[PDB]
């Protein structure tokens, strides 16, 4: 009916982007070394 009153917009700044990229790549390093066996 009427527009949903629970509308929100997500956000992510450059610091969060850098932290996420670093976490992804470090986890990839460690567990790729362990998964290739």
């Amino acid at each position: 009916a009427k527009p949903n009153p629970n509308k929100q917009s997500v956000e992510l700044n450059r610091t969060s982007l850098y932290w996420g990229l670093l976490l992804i790549f470090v986890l990839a390093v460690l567990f790729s070394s362990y998964i290739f066996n």
Partner: peptide
Amino acid sequence: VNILGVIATALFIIIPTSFLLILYVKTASQ
């Protein structure tokens, strides 16, 4: 050496990276 590790590594690298890039580009545009 497990040759199935290449695809797993690629997916784990790329999918969260794409999610983060989507969020950041949307925020920077906004």
